Amino acid sequence: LCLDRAADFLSEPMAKEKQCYLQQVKQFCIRVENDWHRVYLVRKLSSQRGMEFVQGLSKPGRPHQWVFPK
Amino acid sequence: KNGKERVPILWHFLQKEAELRLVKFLPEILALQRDLVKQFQNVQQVEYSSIRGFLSKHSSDGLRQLLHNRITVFLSTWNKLRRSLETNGEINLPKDYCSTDLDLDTEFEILLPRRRGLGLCATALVSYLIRLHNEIVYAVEKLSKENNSYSVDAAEVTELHVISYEVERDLTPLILSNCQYQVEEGRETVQEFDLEKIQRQIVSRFLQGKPRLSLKGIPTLVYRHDWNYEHLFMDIKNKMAQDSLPSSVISAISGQLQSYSDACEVLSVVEVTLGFLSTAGGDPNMQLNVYTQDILQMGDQTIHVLKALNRCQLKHTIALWQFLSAHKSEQLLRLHKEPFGEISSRYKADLSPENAKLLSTFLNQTGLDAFLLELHEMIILKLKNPQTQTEERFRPQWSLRDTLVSYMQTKESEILPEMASQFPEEILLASCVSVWKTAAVLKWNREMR
Amino acid sequence: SILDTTRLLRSCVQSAVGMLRDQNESCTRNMRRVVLLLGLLNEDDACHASFLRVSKMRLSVFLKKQEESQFHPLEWLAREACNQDALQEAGTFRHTLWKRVQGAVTPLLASMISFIDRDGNLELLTRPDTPPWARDLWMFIFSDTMLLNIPLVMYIVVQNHMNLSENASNNVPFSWKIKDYLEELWVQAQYITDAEGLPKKFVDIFQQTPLGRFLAQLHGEPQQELLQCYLKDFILLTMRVSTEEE
Amino acid sequence: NELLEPLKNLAFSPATMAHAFLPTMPEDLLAQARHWYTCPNGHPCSCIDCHAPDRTQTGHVLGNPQRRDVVTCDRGLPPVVFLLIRLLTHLALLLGASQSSQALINIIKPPVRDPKGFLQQHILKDLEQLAKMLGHSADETIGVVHLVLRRLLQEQHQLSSRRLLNFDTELSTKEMRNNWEKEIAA
Ligand SMILES: [Zn+2]
């Protein structure tokens, strides 16, 4: 549900609380190393925005590269 | 899942949910409109700039902010519904009104739900709740198996009656709690929504009540200049019986009232009596002087009135008004004074030679007394008021015969053979004052002879 | 004095009441209004004298407000002398002027009657069982021009708020205006003051008002009875009740 | 196929569909209902307050898509099916706007400066609502759209005969449009 909330916040086409929550999720993902958590997130993002949105986030010059596994 | 049969309440609720959520607001909108009525009721002119101006006028900070809140609720609800109201609502609405969203700069009239102009929008929105709530209540009633669900009117409306639900707070937890899952060895989990239980819970929570209606009316008063006596006459006739003046009584009053002043005095007493009877009523056989003196206590100002009205009864009142008015004007005509200053000159057109001969022939072979009285009543009621100008179904170019027949019909009055047959269609509504003048001149000549 | 304004009012009572229409369709109202106003428009008792005086004062207020919109309001006699229609309707000049004043006063008197006698008010002045405090409050409110604000008007509808039965009246004079007043004071105090401290601020603001000081004059059982009556009218104004037990 | 001809006209020959009734339409239920009565002068009445005892529009009448949180169709059809009809219609309209914009400006009410983008936004909102209704991914939803278009292409000469469906290729009236809708839905 936390990853779902982050996926929604990212799906939006700009708030301190959302950004702080996203940073906490980033740190949690980096710390715990269970990359399955990011798989779900990518999956949810694809469901909401589409695969091309995730592809666009993967490309260099992107701020959300942490969404993806290693 | 065959829901319209299996779950009709849930089906209709889900269809209308988008709009039904807005049903919770309308108690507040009703309170707003009630206070707006209270403030502006019995007022006729509205010089307010707009809602922003109106708020600035009632800038008492507490009251300003409460009004602002309510107005914002109204504007939000209207903005959402307006595009549905343009197609649904049972109340027609010019496309311009529903076209664009409203803001504080919008005209203030939009908030007063008058039965005309921009106030129809305030009426429509209030009506469109009433349909939605009622319709889903009907849906529940058809499945309650009962026929006594207590109704309520738009005055007693409170949040307890309206269908108040919040999607996230109330509904979503309901669905999620009903949403169940199934699994079998080697098979995926699959949902199975307990649709019956969703319906039963929604019914148990939200669905009860019924509203009716409430609001003002624009014609607040049509006083002296535009006074619509026709409405008073019809109200009285509905309330009690009415009768024409016997020719004996007519001649008696004519002999007594040999002066315009006395006529006016009697007529003022008749007008007071008309107002009272229209509201209250009374025994049609009661003598009018006894009524004015005993009940209305109209003493200290009744000298010759009591002698003229000694024979007249309440049922004669309308006919007596008509006689007096025509006699009043007739007196003026006898003295060559203009009695129809309140009438538009356009309605005072001449009569051409051909139409003059035709009218003279009709009048020679006509019921001159009834004709004069009816034409006078028609002129005075219809053709007199600027108010009757803004309703121009009495255009000078309309024929006089059909106009007068229409009028007589609206009061369910008896039709004289001469009206359809002998009355010339060649005479329009513009010569009506020339027609009355010619008829009165012929009457006066017959009386002098 | 110059004019018998008492007589002019009494002459205009019927014409004014004839302007009044009720929402609840209480046919038996206008007649009783006429009886009541002709009884009250006297100098027999001090209550009648005060009612008549306040009627005259408020009429003066309305007429002055109208006069502030007209040119040379001293020339009214002259204007009547220029209305051949009114002259010939009246016959004598003196009656012309009398009718002029009656026409000016009748609308305003009808308006004032609509405000004062909204639900069943006037029964309270005349009914002998009406306690003294009730008549005193009636006249206090009627005398006040900023509490009982009556706007001008240029079919008058008497906005009956209760569904009361006829032969019955509001147990407290102008219960509706008092309710509106206390609600305005509640709003003002609420937005000025926190949810805690609002009760005390609302009570204080009220006590500082004319009506608060008036009711502060009332001590003991009269005030208790007033409160009971106001509760009853408050309920009737808030919730529609089809029975008396409820 | 005959069923496609209205949409084919919209896309390739929009000028003809100027006065056409499109599925992009809500209708006056009053015209179907033939409560609040009305006086002869026009002011409503539930004699009271008066002293005296078709709103169906053509063209594309939907305004800013931002308001479209939920879909409702008066003709009792499944909201999903009406949504798909609306989507196909908007695609045809987008094609027509590409062919000639002014025609769509005539067909779209209130007017607009950028018809194609407007229709794009409506289509995207349609996709959003489809995702909400069916519960599938955005791409799966677009796949449902492609599935439906495929069905129409396969049901093109499979519609050879058994074809008595009362509708005109120009959607001249309200019943022609309703009939086209119901056939499409079937
Ligand atoms: Zn109407």
Side-chain angles (χ1 to χ4, degrees):
Chain A
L1 296 172
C2 303
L3 296 165
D4 254 20
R5 200 79 187 230
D8 309 347
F9 292 161
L10 288 165
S11 295
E12 307 185 30
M14 195 139 62
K16 264 66 69 178
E17 292 78 18
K18 298 181 178 178
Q19 291 152 323
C20 189
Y21 175 81
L22 288 169
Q23 187 68 9
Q24 290 147 187
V25 171
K26 178 176 180 183
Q27 198 71 7
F28 160 86
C29 289
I30 292 168
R31 189 182 76 251
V32 179
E33 283 268 330
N34 202 22
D35 257 6
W36 276 129
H37 302 176
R38 286 196 176 98
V39 167
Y40 186 102
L41 183 63
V42 167
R43 279 170 170 181
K44 195 74 190 196
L45 282 166
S46 323
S47 187
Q48 295 183 279
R49 301 297 267 88
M51 187 167 98
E52 257 203 281
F53 181 81
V54 173
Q55 286 185 337
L57 293 186
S58 75
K59 283 193 141 166
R62 264 38 266 291
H64 309 145
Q65 290 189 342
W66 61 266
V67 163
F68 302 80
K70 268 83 170 279
Chain B
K1 281 194 188 164
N2 196 27
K4 197 169 181 181
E5 302 190 326
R6 183 217 197 178
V7 283
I9 312 308
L10 188 48
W11 180 86
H12 187 82
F13 175 45
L14 293 161
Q15 292 286 345
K16 261 74 194 301
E17 187 292 320
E19 290 182 344
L20 274 165
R21 63 209 272 188
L22 293 106
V23 162
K24 79 202 176 191
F25 306 139
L26 232 92
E28 258 302 300
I29 292 183
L30 280 167
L32 181 62
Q33 265 141 359
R34 175 201 77 183
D35 300 63
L36 281 169
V37 159
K38 197 181 194 181
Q39 174 172 348
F40 286 76
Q41 183 185 308
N42 291 316
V43 184
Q44 292 167 110
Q45 66 97 345
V46 175
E47 71 279 52
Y48 285 76
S49 147
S50 55
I51 322 169
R52 178 158 282 124
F54 168 75
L55 287 167
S56 79
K57 205 150 217 199
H58 278 266
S59 272
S60 175
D61 292 354
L63 179 61
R64 177 173 69 266
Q65 176 179 358
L66 182 59
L67 295 168
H68 176 76
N69 297 353
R70 294 186 153 146
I71 288 157
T72 309
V73 183
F74 184 88
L75 296 161
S76 178
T77 305
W78 172 259
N79 287 327
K80 308 200 64 206
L81 257 296
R82 69 188 176 63
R83 261 230 186 270
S84 300
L85 300 181
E86 191 169 2
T87 74
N88 311 22
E90 309 176 39
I91 298 158
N92 203 288
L93 244 313
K95 297 183 196 178
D96 43 323
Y97 295 3
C98 302
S99 87
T100 48
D101 44 88
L102 312 183
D103 47 10
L104 295 171
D105 313 297
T106 287
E107 299 294 312
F108 176 60
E109 272 87 58
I110 200 82
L111 295 159
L112 308 171
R114 284 164 159 199
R115 300 285 208 270
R116 314 171 209 164
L118 301 170
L120 282 170
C121 304
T123 306
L125 193 68
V126 162
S127 177
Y128 199 90
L129 144 72
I130 280 163
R131 285 169 50 66
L132 288 174
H133 186 312
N134 287 3
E135 198 171 55
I136 183 170
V137 159
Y138 302 158
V140 170
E141 189 165 52
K142 184 179 300 148
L143 274 88
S144 75
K145 285 76 69 212
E146 294 201 3
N147 324 48
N148 39 353
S149 209
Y150 72 92
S151 154
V152 157
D153 286 13
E156 305 93 60
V157 161
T158 55
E159 293 86 282
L160 269 174
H161 311 113
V162 295
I163 301 172
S164 100
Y165 66 107
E166 271 291 2
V167 186
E168 319 310 324
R169 318 182 62 268
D170 302 314
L171 187 55
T172 307
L174 194 147
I175 315 172
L176 300 175
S177 45
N178 296 108
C179 165
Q180 278 177 358
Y181 297 77
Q182 309 174 13
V183 197
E184 334 179 65
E185 303 296 295
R187 321 206 62 258
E188 287 95 328
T189 62
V190 52
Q191 299 172 339
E192 188 69 299
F193 290 33
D194 212 343
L195 271 179
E196 303 99 13
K197 203 160 173 164
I198 301 168
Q199 175 193 242
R200 287 191 309 88
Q201 293 177 7
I202 294 174
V203 165
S204 84
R205 280 75 188 278
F206 313 105
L207 312 178
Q208 272 109 58
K210 246 168 170 173
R212 192 89 199 279
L213 89 177
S214 101
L215 241 260
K216 307 148 98 272
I218 290 164
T220 302
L221 220 174
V222 277
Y223 70 97
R224 307 141 271 255
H225 325 167
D226 56 285
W227 214 312
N228 186 22
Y229 284 99
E230 185 186 346
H231 163 269
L232 304 174
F233 294 176
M234 176 265 290
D235 281 355
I236 301 156
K237 288 182 189 195
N238 294 358
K239 289 206 178 65
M240 50 178 304
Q242 284 283 307
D243 191 311
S244 146
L245 291 202
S247 301
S248 151
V249 175
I250 298 173
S251 75
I253 300 175
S254 304
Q256 294 174 278
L257 306 192
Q258 293 285 304
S259 154
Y260 183 99
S261 326
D262 300 71
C264 296
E265 295 158 54
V266 176
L267 181 54
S268 73
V269 180
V270 172
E271 285 180 340
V272 169
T273 305
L274 286 164
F276 279 85
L277 292 186
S278 147
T279 306
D283 184 7
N285 306 282
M286 184 155 196
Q287 279 279 350
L288 176 56
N289 61 347
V290 173
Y291 182 73
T292 52
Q293 295 175 266
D294 295 355
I295 313 195
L296 311 191
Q297 312 198 358
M298 289 180 64
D300 212 80
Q301 301 298 343
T302 41
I303 319 188
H304 295 358
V305 178
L306 305 179
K307 297 96 181 182
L309 310 184
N310 182 44
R311 312 160 219 85
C312 301
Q313 309 182 283
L314 305 188
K315 57 202 181 180
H316 300 143
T317 313
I318 303 173
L320 174 71
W321 180 98
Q322 188 175 17
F323 170 62
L324 289 171
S325 178
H327 188 241
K328 178 172 174 195
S329 299
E330 270 204 68
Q331 287 305 313
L332 298 166
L333 183 57
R334 275 177 181 69
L335 284 96
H336 302 59
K337 316 161 88 283
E338 283 296 326
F340 289 116
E342 315 182 51
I343 309 305
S344 317
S345 146
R346 75 182 204 155
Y347 297 110
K348 306 184 178 173
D350 289 324
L351 269 158
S352 54
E354 277 68 29
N355 279 355
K357 301 160 186 292
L358 289 168
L359 176 61
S360 51
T361 302
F362 168 80
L363 292 173
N364 260 281
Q365 314 200 133
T366 283
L368 200 62
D369 276 309
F371 178 59
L372 275 169
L373 291 164
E374 296 328 315
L375 179 60
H376 196 259
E377 189 161 271
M378 185 213 81
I379 286 169
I380 297 291
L381 304 190
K382 309 303 197 176
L383 323 182
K384 188 187 64 153
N385 319 321
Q387 187 143 333
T388 55
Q389 299 315 261
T390 167
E391 59 249 5
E392 248 164 20
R393 46 156 163 157
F394 286 100
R395 298 196 162 91
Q397 298 83 9
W398 262 27
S399 179
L400 178 57
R401 179 188 68 211
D402 49 28
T403 314
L404 184 49
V405 172
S406 176
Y407 177 47
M408 290 196 73
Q409 289 176 346
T410 63
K411 55 169 168 171
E412 306 102 344
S413 53
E414 311 232 311
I415 292 308
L416 304 314
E418 310 98 279
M419 279 308 314
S421 68
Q422 304 192 5
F423 213 136
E425 58 184 36
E426 298 94 339
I427 294 172
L428 328 181
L429 212 70
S431 294
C432 94
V433 167
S434 289
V435 171
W436 191 98
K437 289 185 175 162
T438 307
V441 166
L442 179 63
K443 175 168 168 176
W444 171 24
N445 294 348
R446 288 181 174 179
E447 285 192 324
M448 278 296 163
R449 283 162 155 188
Chain C
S1 84
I2 303 186
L3 189 134
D4 196 1
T5 56
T6 303
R7 198 176 312 270
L8 191 135
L9 284 173
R10 290 176 70 77
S11 82
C12 292
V13 165
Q14 303 88 355
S15 62
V17 166
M19 310 194 67
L20 307 179
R21 284 194 51 56
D22 303 288
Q23 306 293 68
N24 301 322
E25 301 332 287
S26 211
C27 303
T28 188
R29 199 71 213 132
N30 286 345
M31 173 230 68
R32 189 60 185 296
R33 286 179 180 127
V34 171
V35 173
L36 290 165
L37 294 169
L38 298 177
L40 291 171
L41 292 161
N42 287 318
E43 299 209 354
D44 303 327
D45 278 6
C47 182
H48 301 172
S50 302
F51 173 82
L52 182 62
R53 185 185 72 247
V54 173
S55 299
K56 291 181 186 177
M57 178 272 288
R58 301 197 79 128
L59 256 296
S60 82
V61 170
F62 298 135
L63 289 164
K64 179 152 167 58
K65 213 201 170 205
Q66 294 206 138
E67 281 171 1
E68 288 321 318
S69 73
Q70 304 171 11
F71 84 122
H72 311 320
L74 291 164
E75 292 185 344
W76 70 280
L77 181 141
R79 290 193 297 280
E80 227 60 28
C82 293
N83 195 2
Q84 181 46 39
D85 293 79
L87 269 302
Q88 68 191 36
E89 291 185 330
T92 84
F93 195 45
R94 273 213 175 99
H95 197 54
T96 310
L97 300 177
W98 186 256
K99 283 174 60 72
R100 178 51 160 99
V101 183
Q102 286 181 321
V105 164
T106 290
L108 305 178
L109 176 63
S111 179
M112 181 169 63
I113 294 158
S114 85
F115 279 83
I116 72 196
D117 193 43
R118 270 221 209 294
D119 292 277
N121 235 17
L122 292 171
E123 311 306 320
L124 293 170
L125 283 173
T126 60
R127 277 201 276 99
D129 53 29
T130 302
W133 71 255
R135 290 201 188 89
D136 290 345
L137 177 58
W138 205 113
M139 283 304 313
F140 173 80
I141 299 170
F142 184 41
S143 74
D144 201 324
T145 55
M146 48 67 54
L147 162 57
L148 192 79
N149 182 27
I150 293 173
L152 273 180
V153 298
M154 309 195 66
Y155 318 139
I156 293 152
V157 191
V158 189
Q159 193 164 0
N160 320 107
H161 304 102
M162 322 189 190
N163 64 353
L164 267 177
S165 163
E166 233 292 325
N167 314 136
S169 62
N170 43 356
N171 283 61
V172 153
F174 316 87
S175 284
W176 64 267
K177 190 61 174 49
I178 301 174
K179 189 174 182 289
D180 292 356
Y181 186 70
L182 287 166
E183 283 175 13
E184 281 184 40
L185 291 188
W186 154 275
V187 166
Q188 292 177 345
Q190 188 170 21
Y191 292 9
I192 294 160
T193 311
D194 183 60
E196 185 65 8
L198 165 61
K200 197 252 175 61
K201 190 55 169 214
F202 176 54
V203 164
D204 286 357
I205 290 165
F206 179 72
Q207 277 171 289
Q208 296 311 326
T209 54
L211 178 59
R213 289 170 177 162
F214 174 77
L215 301 182
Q217 300 181 2
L218 301 173
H219 292 286
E221 180 147 27
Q223 189 180 124
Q224 292 162 28
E225 196 182 34
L226 160 75
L227 195 57
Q228 292 294 336
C229 290
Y230 193 66
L231 283 165
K232 196 242 61 179
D233 281 352
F234 181 93
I235 294 156
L236 286 187
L237 294 159
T238 304
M239 331 170 87
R240 182 177 81 180
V241 191
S242 323
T243 94
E244 180 134 35
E245 301 84 0
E246 181 176 7
Chain D
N1 169 228
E2 327 314 337
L3 208 53
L4 310 183
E5 292 276 309
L7 296 181
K8 192 183 186 172
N9 283 324
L10 281 172
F12 307 114
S13 275
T16 73
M17 303 295 283
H19 314 288
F21 291 65
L22 328 177
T24 90
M25 72 191 282
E27 306 139 33
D28 191 352
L29 303 208
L30 175 139
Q32 175 45 225
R34 290 182 178 169
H35 276 280
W36 288 68
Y37 321 97
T38 201
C39 96
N41 292 321
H43 39 244
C45 284
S46 202
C47 167
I48 298 288
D49 299 16
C50 42
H51 305 320
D54 192 349
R55 288 173 289 167
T56 314
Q57 209 207 118
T58 33
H60 174 85
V61 299
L62 311 193
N64 71 309
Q66 297 163 23
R67 304 182 181 292
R68 291 183 44 196
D69 45 312
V70 186
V71 174
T72 70
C73 93
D74 311 1
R75 315 98 173 172
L77 290 183
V80 171
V81 176
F82 181 54
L83 209 179
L84 291 156
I85 288 158
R86 186 125 74 186
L87 185 43
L88 294 163
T89 309
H90 285 146
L91 294 158
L93 288 162
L94 191 56
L95 290 164
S98 43
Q99 300 305 325
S100 308
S101 37
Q102 189 60 65
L104 279 280
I105 296 169
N106 310 345
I107 284 163
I108 296 151
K109 296 158 191 151
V112 293
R113 320 180 161 191
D114 176 46
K116 55 194 313 309
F118 171 73
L119 290 168
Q120 281 188 319
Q121 293 170 18
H122 271 283
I123 292 159
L124 294 165
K125 205 75 183 166
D126 299 339
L127 290 170
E128 183 213 297
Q129 293 177 316
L130 279 169
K132 288 170 168 177
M133 297 169 164
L134 299 167
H136 298 314
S137 323
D139 292 318
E140 285 175 325
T141 303
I142 295 158
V144 180
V145 189
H146 292 291
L147 282 165
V148 165
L149 272 172
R150 159 168 181 259
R151 187 57 171 247
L152 292 169
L153 179 64
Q154 293 176 329
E155 299 226 44
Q156 73 87 15
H157 64 320
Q158 196 163 35
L159 301 172
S160 147
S161 194
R162 224 287 292 174
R163 56 128 277 274
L164 275 154
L165 304 322
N166 187 220
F167 75 85
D168 186 5
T169 52
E170 310 176 347
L171 287 172
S172 325
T173 88
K174 175 175 179 159
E175 274 295 329
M176 310 272 84
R177 171 284 320 174
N178 191 11
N179 287 346
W180 183 96
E181 285 192 81
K182 296 191 176 188
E183 292 309 308
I184 287 282

